[PDB]
Tab-separated table of C-alpha atoms in Angstrom:
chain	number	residue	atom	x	y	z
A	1	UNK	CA	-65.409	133.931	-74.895
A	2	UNK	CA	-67.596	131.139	-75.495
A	3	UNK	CA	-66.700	128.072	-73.696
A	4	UNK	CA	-68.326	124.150	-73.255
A	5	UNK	CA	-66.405	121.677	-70.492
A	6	UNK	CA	-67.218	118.414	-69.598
A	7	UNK	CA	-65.608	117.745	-66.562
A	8	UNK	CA	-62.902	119.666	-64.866
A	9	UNK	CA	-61.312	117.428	-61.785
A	10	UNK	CA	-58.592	119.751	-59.561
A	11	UNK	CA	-57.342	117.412	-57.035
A	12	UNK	CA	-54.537	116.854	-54.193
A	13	UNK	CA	-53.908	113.217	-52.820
B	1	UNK	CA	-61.911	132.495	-78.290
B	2	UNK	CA	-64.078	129.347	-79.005
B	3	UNK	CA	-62.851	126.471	-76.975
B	4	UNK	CA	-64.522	122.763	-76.754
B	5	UNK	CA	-62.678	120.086	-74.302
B	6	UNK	CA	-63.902	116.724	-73.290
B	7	UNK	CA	-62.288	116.237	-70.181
B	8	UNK	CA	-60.040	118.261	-67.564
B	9	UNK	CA	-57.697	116.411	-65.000
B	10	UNK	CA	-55.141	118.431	-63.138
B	11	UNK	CA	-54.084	115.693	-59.899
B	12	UNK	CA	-51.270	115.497	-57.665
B	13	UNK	CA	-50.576	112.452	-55.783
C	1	UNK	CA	-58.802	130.857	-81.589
C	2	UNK	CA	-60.972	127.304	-82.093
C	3	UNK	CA	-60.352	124.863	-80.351
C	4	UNK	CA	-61.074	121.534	-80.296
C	5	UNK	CA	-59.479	118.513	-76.737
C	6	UNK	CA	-60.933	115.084	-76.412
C	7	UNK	CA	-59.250	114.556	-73.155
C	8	UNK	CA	-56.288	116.963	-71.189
C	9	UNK	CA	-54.538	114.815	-68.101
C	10	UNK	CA	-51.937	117.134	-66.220
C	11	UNK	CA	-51.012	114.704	-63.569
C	12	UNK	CA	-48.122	114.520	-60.832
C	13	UNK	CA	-47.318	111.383	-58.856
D	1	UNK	CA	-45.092	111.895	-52.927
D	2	UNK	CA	-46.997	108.717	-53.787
D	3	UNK	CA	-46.056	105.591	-52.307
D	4	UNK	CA	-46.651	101.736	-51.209
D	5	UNK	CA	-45.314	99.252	-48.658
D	6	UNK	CA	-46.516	95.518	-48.274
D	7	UNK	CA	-44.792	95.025	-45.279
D	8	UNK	CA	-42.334	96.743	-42.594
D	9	UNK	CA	-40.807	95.395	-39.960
D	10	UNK	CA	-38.701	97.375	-37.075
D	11	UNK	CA	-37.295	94.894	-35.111
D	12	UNK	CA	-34.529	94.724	-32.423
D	13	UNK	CA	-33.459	91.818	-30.409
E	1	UNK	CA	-41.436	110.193	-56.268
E	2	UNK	CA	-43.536	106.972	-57.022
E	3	UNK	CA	-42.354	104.092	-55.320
E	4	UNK	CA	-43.436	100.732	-54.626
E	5	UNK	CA	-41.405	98.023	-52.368
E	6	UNK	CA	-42.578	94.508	-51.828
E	7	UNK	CA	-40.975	93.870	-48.099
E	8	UNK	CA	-38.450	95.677	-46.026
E	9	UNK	CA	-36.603	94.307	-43.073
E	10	UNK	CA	-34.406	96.269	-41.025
E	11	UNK	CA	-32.629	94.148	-38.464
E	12	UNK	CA	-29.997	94.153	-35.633
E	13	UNK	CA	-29.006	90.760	-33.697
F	1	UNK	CA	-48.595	112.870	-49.566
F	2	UNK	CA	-50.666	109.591	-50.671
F	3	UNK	CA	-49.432	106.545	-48.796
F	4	UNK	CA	-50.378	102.418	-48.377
F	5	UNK	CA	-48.879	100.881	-45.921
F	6	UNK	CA	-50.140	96.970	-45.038
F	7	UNK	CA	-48.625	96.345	-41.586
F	8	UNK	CA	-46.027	97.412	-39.370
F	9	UNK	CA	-44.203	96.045	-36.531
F	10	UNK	CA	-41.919	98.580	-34.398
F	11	UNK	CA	-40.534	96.196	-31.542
F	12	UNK	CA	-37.932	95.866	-29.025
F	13	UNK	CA	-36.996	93.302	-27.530
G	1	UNK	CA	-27.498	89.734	-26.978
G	2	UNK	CA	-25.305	89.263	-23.902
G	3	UNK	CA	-23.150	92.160	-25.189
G	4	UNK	CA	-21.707	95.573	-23.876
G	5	UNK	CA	-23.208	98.293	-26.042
G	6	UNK	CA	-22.419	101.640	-25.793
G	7	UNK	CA	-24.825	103.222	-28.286
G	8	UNK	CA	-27.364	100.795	-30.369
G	9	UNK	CA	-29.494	102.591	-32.870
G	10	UNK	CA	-31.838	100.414	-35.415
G	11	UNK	CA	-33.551	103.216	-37.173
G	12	UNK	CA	-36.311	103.364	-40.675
G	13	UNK	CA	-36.598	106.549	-42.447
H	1	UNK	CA	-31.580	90.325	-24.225
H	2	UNK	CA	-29.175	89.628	-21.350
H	3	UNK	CA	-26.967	92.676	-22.015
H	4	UNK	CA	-25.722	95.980	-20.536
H	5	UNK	CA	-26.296	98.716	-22.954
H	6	UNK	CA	-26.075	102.524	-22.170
H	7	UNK	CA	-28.378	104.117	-24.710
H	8	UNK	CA	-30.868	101.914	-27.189
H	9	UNK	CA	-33.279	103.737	-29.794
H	10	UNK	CA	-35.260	101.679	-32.256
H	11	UNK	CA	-36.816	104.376	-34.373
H	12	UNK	CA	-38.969	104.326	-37.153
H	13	UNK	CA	-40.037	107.865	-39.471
I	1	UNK	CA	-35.029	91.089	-20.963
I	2	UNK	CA	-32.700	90.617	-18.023
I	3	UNK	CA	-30.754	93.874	-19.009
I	4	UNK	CA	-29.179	96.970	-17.755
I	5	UNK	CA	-30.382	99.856	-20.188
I	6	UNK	CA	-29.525	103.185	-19.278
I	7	UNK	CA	-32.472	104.978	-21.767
I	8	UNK	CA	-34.670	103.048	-23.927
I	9	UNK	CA	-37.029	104.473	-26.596
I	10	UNK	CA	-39.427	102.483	-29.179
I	11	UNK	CA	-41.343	105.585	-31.292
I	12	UNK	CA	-42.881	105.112	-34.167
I	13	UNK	CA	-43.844	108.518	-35.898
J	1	UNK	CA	-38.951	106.556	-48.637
J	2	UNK	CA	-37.320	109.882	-47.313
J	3	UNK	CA	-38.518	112.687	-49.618
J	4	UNK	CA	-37.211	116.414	-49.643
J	5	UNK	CA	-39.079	118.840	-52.401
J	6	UNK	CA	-38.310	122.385	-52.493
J	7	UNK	CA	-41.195	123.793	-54.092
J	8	UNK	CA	-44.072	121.791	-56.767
J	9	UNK	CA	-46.427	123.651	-59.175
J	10	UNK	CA	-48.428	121.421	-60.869
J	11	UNK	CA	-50.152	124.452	-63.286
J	12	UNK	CA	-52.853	124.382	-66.146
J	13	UNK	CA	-52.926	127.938	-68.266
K	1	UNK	CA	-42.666	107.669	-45.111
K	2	UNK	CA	-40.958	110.756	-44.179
K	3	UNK	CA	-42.172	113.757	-46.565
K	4	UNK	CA	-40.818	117.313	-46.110
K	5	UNK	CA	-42.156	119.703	-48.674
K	6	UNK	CA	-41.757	123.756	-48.749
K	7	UNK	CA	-44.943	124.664	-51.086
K	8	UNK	CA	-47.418	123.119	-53.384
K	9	UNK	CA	-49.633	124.612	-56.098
K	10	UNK	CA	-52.767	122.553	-57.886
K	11	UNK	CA	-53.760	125.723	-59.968
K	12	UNK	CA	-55.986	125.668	-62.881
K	13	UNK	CA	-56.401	128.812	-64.768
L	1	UNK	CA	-46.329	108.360	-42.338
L	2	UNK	CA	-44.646	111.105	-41.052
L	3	UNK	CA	-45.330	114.957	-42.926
L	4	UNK	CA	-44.314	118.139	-42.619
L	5	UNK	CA	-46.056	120.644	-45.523
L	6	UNK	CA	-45.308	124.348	-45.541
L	7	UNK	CA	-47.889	126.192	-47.405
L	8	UNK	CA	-50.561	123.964	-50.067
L	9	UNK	CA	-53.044	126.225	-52.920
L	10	UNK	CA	-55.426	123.801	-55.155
L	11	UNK	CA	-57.429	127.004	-56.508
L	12	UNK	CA	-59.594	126.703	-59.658
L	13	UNK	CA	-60.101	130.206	-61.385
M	1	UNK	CA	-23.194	122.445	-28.186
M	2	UNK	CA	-24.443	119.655	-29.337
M	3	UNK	CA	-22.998	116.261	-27.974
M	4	UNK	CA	-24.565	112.248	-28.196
M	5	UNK	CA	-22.838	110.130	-25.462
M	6	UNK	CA	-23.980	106.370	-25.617
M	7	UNK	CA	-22.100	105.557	-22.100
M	8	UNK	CA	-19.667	107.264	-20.004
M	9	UNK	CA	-17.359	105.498	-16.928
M	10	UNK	CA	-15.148	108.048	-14.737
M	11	UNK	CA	-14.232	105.480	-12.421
M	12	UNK	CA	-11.187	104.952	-9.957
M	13	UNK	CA	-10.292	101.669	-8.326
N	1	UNK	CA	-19.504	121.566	-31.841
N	2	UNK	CA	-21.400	118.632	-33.091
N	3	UNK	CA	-19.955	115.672	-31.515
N	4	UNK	CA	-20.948	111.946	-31.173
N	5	UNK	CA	-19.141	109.666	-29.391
N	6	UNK	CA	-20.092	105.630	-28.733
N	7	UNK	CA	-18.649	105.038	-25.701
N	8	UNK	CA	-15.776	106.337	-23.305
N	9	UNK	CA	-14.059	104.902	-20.295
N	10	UNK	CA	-11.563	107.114	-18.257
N	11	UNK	CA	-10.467	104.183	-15.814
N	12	UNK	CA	-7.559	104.286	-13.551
N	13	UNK	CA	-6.559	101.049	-11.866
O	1	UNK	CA	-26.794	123.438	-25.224
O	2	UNK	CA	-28.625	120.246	-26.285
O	3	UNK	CA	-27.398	117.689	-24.878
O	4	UNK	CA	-28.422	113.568	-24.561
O	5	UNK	CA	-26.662	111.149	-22.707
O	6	UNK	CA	-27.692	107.396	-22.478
O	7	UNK	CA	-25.748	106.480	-19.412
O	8	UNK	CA	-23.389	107.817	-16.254
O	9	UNK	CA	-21.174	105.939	-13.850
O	10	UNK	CA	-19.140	108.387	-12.059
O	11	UNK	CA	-17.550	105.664	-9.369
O	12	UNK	CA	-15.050	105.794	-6.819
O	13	UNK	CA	-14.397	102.235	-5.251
P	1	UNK	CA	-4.746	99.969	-4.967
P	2	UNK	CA	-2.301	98.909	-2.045
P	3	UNK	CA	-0.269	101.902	-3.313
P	4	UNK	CA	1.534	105.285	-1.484
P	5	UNK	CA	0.457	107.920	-3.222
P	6	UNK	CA	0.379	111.838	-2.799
P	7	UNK	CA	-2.778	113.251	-5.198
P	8	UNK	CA	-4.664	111.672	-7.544
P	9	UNK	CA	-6.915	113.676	-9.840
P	10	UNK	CA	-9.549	111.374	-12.319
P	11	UNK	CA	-11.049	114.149	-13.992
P	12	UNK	CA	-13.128	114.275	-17.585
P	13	UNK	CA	-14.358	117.742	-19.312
Q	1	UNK	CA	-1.181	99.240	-8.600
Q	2	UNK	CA	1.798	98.569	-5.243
Q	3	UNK	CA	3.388	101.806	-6.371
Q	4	UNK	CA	4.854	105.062	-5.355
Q	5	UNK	CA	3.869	107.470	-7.200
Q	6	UNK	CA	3.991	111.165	-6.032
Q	7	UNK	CA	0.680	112.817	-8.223
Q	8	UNK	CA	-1.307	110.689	-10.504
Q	9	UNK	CA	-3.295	112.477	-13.515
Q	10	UNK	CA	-6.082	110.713	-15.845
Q	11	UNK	CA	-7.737	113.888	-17.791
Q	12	UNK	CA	-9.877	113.373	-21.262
Q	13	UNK	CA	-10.897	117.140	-22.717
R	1	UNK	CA	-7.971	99.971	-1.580
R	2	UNK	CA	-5.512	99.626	1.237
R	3	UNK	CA	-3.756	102.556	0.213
R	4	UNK	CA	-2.443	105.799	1.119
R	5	UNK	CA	-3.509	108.640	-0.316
R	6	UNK	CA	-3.233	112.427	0.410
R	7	UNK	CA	-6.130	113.769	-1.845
R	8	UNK	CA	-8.871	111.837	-4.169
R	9	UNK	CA	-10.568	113.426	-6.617
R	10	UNK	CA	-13.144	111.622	-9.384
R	11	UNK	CA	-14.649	114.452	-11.212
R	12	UNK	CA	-17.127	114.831	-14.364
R	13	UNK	CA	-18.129	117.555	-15.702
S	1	UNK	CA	-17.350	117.113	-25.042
S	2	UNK	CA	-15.317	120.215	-23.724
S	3	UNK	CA	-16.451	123.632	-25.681
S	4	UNK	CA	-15.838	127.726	-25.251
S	5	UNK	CA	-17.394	130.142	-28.088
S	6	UNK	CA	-17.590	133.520	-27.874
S	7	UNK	CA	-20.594	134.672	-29.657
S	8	UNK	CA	-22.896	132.842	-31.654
S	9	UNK	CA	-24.734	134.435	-34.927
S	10	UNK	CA	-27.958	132.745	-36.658
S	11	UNK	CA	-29.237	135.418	-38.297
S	12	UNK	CA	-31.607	135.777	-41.321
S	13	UNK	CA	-32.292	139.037	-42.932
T	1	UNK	CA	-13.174	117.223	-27.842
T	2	UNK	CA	-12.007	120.081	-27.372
T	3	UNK	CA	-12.902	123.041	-29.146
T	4	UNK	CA	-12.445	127.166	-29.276
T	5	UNK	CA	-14.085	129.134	-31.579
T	6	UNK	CA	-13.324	133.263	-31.627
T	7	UNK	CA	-16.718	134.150	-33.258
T	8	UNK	CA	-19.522	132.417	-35.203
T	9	UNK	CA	-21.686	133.713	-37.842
T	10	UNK	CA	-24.167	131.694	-39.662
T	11	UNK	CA	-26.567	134.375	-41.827
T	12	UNK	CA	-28.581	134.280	-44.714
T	13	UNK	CA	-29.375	137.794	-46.344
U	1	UNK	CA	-20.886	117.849	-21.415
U	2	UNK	CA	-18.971	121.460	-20.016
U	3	UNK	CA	-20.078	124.423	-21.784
U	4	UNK	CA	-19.713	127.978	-22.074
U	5	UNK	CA	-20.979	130.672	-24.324
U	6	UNK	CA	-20.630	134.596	-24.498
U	7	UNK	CA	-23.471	135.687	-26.010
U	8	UNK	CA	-26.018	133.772	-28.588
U	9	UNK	CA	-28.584	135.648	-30.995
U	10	UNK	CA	-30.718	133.299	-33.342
U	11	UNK	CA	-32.673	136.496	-34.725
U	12	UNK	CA	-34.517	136.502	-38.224
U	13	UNK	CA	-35.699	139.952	-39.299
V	1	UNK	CA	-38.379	143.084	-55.927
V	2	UNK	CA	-40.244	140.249	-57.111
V	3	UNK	CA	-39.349	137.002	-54.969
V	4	UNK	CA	-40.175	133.148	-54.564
V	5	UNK	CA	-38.545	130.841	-52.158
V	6	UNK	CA	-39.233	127.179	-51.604
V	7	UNK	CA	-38.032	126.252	-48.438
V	8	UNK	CA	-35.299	128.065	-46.936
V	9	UNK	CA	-33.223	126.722	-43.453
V	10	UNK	CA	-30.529	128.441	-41.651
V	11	UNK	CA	-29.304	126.434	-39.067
V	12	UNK	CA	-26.354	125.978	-36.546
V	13	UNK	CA	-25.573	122.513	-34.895
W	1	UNK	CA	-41.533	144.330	-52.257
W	2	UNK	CA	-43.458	141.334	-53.789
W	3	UNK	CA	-42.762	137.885	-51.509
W	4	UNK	CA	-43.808	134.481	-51.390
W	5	UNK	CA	-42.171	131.949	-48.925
W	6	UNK	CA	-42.999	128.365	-48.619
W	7	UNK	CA	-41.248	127.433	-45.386
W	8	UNK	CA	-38.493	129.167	-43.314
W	9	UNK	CA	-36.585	127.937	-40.118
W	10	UNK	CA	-33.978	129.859	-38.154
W	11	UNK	CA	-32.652	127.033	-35.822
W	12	UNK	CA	-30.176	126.783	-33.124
W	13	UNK	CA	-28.780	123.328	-32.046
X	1	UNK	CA	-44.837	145.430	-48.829
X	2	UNK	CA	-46.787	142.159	-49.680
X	3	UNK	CA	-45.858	139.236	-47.862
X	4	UNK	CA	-47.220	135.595	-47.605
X	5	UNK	CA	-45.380	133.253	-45.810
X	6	UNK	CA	-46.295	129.367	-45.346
X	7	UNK	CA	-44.705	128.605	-41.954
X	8	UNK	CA	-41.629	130.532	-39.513
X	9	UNK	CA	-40.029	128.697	-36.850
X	10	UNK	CA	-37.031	130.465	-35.245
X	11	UNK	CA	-36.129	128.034	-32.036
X	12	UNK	CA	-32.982	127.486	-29.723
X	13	UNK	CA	-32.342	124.390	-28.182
Y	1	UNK	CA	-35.669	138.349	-48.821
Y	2	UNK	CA	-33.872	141.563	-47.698
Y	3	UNK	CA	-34.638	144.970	-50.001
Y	4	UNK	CA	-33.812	148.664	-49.793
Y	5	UNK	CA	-35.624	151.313	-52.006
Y	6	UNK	CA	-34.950	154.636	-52.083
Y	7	UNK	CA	-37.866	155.717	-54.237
Y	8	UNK	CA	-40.351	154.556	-55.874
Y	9	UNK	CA	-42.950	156.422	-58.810
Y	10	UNK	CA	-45.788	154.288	-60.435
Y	11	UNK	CA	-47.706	156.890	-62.333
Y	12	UNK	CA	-49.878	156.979	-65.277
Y	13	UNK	CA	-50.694	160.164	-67.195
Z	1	UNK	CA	-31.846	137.808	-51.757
Z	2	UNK	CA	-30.376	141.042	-50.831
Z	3	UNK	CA	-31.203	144.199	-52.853
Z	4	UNK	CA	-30.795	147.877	-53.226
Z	5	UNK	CA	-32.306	150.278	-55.388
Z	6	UNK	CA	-31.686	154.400	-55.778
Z	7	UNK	CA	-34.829	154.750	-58.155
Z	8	UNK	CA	-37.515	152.885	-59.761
Z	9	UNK	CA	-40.366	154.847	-62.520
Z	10	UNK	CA	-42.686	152.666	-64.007
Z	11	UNK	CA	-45.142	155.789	-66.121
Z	12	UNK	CA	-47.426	154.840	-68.847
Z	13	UNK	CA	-47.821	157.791	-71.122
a	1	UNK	CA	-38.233	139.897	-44.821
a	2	UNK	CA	-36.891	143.055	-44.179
a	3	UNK	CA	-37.643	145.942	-45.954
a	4	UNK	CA	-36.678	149.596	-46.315
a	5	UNK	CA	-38.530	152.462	-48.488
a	6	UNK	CA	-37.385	155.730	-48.359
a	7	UNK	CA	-41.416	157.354	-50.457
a	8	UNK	CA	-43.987	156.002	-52.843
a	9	UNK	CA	-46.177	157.381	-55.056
a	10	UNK	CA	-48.675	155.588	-56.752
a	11	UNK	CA	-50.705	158.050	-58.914
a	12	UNK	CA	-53.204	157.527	-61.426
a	13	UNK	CA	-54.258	161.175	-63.612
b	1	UNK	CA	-54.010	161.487	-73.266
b	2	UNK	CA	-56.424	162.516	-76.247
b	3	UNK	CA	-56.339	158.376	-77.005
b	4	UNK	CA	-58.881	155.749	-77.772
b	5	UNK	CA	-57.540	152.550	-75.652
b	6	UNK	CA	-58.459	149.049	-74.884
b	7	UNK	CA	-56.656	148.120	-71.918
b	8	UNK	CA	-53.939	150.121	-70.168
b	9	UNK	CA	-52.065	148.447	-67.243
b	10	UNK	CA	-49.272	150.014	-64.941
b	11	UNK	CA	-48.271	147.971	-62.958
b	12	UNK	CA	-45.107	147.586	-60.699
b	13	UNK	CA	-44.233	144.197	-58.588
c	1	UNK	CA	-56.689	162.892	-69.436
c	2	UNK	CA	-59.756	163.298	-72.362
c	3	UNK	CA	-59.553	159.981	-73.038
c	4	UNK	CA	-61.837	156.895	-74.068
c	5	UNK	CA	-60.453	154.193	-71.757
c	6	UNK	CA	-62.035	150.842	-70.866
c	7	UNK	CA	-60.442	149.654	-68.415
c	8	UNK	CA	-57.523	151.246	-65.927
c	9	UNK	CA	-55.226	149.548	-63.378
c	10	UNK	CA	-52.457	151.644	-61.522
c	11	UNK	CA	-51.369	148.733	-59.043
c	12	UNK	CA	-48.508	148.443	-56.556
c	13	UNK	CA	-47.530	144.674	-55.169
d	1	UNK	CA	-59.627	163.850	-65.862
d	2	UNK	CA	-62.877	164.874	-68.311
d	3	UNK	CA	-62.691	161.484	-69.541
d	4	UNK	CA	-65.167	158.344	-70.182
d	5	UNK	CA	-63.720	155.653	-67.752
d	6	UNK	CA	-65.228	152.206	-67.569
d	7	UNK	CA	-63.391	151.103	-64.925
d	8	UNK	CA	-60.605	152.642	-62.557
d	9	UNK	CA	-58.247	150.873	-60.261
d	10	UNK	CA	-55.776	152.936	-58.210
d	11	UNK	CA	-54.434	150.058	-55.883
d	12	UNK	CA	-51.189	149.494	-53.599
d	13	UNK	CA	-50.379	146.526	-51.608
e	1	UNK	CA	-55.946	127.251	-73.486
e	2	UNK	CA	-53.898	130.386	-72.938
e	3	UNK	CA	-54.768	133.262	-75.277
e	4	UNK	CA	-54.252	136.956	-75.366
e	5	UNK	CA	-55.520	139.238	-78.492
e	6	UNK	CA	-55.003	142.914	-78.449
e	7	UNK	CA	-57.908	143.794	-81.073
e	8	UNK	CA	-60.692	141.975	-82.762
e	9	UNK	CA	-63.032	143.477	-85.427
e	10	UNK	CA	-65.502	141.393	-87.115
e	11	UNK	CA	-67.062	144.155	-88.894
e	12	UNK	CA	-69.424	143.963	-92.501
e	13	UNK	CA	-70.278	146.952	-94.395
f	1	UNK	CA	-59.506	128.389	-70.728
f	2	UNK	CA	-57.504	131.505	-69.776
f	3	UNK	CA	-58.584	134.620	-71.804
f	4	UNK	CA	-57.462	138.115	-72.314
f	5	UNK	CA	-58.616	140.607	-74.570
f	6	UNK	CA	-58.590	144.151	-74.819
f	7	UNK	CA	-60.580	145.330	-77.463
f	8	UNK	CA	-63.734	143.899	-79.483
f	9	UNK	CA	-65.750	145.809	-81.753
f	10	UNK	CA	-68.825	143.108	-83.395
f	11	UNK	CA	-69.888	146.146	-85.787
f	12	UNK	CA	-72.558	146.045	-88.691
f	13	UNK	CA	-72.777	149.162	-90.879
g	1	UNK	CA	-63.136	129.990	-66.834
g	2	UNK	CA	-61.016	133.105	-66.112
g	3	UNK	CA	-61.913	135.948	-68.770
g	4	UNK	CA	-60.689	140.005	-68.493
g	5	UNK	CA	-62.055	141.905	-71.211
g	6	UNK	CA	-61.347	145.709	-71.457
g	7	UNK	CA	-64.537	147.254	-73.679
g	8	UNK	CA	-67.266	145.345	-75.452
g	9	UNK	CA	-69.252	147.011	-78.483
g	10	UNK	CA	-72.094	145.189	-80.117
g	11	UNK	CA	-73.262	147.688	-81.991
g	12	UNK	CA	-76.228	147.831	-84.897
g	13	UNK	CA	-76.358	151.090	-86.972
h	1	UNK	CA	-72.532	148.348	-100.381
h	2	UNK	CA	-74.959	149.355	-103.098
h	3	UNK	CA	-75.564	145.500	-104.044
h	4	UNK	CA	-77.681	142.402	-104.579
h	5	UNK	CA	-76.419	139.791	-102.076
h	6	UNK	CA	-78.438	136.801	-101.333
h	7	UNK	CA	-76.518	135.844	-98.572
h	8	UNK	CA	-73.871	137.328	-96.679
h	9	UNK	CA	-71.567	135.495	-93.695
h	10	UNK	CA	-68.985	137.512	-91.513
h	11	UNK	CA	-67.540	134.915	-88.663
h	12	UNK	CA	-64.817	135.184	-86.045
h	13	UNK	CA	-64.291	131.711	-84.835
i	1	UNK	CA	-76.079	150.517	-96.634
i	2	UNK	CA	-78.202	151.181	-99.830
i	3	UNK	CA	-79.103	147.761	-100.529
i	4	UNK	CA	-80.781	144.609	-100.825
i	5	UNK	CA	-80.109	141.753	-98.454
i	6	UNK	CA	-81.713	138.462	-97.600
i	7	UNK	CA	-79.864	137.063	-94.773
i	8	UNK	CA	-77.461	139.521	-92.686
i	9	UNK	CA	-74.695	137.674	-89.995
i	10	UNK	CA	-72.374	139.222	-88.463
i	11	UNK	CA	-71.237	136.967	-85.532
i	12	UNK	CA	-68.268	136.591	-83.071
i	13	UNK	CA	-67.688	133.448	-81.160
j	1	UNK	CA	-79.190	152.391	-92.920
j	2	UNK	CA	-81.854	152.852	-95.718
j	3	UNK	CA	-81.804	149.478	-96.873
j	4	UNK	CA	-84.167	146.207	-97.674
j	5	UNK	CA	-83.069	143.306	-95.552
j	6	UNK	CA	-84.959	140.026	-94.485
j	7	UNK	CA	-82.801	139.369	-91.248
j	8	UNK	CA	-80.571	141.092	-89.278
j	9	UNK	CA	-78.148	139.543	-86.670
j	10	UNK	CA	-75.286	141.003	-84.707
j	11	UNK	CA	-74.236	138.410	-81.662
j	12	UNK	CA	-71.223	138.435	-80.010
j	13	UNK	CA	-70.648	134.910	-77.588
């Protein structure tokens, strides 16, 4: 598995 | 598995 | 599997 | 649940 | 459930 | 829950 | 107001 | 106000 | 004001 | 607003 | 606002 | 506001 | 049993 | 039972 | 038994 | 009230 | 009220 | 009131 | 409010 | 009211 | 408010 | 037995 | 036996 | 047996 | 959730 | 949910 | 959650 | 048995 | 059982 | 069992 | 991305 | 990204 | 991220 | 095999 | 094998 | 194997 993210936001308001 | 994403926004408001 | 995501928005308001 | 009030008023008299 | 209310008046005289 | 509220007035009178 | 009331309920859910 | 009144609840949730 | 109230209760939760 | 929600997922595979 | 909710899942995988 | 939540999971694997 | 009585007069003249 | 009642007057005169 | 009563008069004149 | 009587019974359950 | 009146019975259930 | 009476009984329960 | 039950059953299995 | 009930059963399996 | 119960189980297994 | 439940109330008034 | 409950209430009134 | 429960209330009133 | 097993083989050879 | 199994084989062979 | 199991066997060979 | 595998998964829920 | 295995999961939930 | 095993999981929950 | 691949040979002779 | 695979064999001969 | 590979063979002959 | 190859490219994307 | 190569890839991404 | 080459690569990502 090769992978490349930029940005990963996981948020509850 | 070759994967490339920009930007990653899982919210709940 | 390629892959290729300019911007993923999984959102819930 | 996402939500917005300008103004609440209770009142009894 | 997104809501948005402007003015809310609950009133007994 | 994400919430706003500007002002609130619970009165008896 | 100068009235006979058995039960007054002024309520906001 | 000037009344006779057995139970009064102004309630807000 | 000038009443006869058997239970009163203002709550604001 | 008066809200009642079983049960949310809010789910990225 | 008056919110009642069972569960809630933000997952990603 | 008033809440009541009865289990919450914002996991990232 | 459950019971909500605003006002209640047993009264003999 | 689940009962609710305004108001009640058992008068004799 | 839950019970809530606002007010009782039991009178004998 | 300026009455003969033999039992009176006022009586609420 | 100026009566005769042998038992007198005012019963709410 | 200037009456008569054999038994009086004003009873809540 | 006048009430007689017999048995009472809030059961969850 | 009045009210007789033999037996009550309220379950969830 | 007159009441009477046999027996009363609120159980969850 | 696999099993996924909400919210769940069992309730007598 | 595999289980997953958000919220549960066994209430009496 | 694998359990995971969010919240248990089991209450008479 | 309420579940009776009599018996129960998970076996790899 | 209510449930009842005699028997349950899950082999890999 | 109630739960009943009359053996288990997990076995790996 | 006497096999050239991957991945092997038994698995019971 | 004389086998080439990478990986082997015998689970019970 | 005279086998080459990378990994081995024998797990019950 | 959600992917599952049972083989994979990228092989040159 | 969510990734399963149960073989891979890169081979040069 | 969330990878599960069985076997891995980078192999030069 | 047995060849002249000037250049040779075997890719799993 | 038994012959002549300038540039050898063999890659998995 | 018994061969003439410049560059060799085998790379699994």
């Amino acid at each position: 598995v090769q992978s490349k993210i930029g940005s990963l936001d996981n948020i509850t308001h």
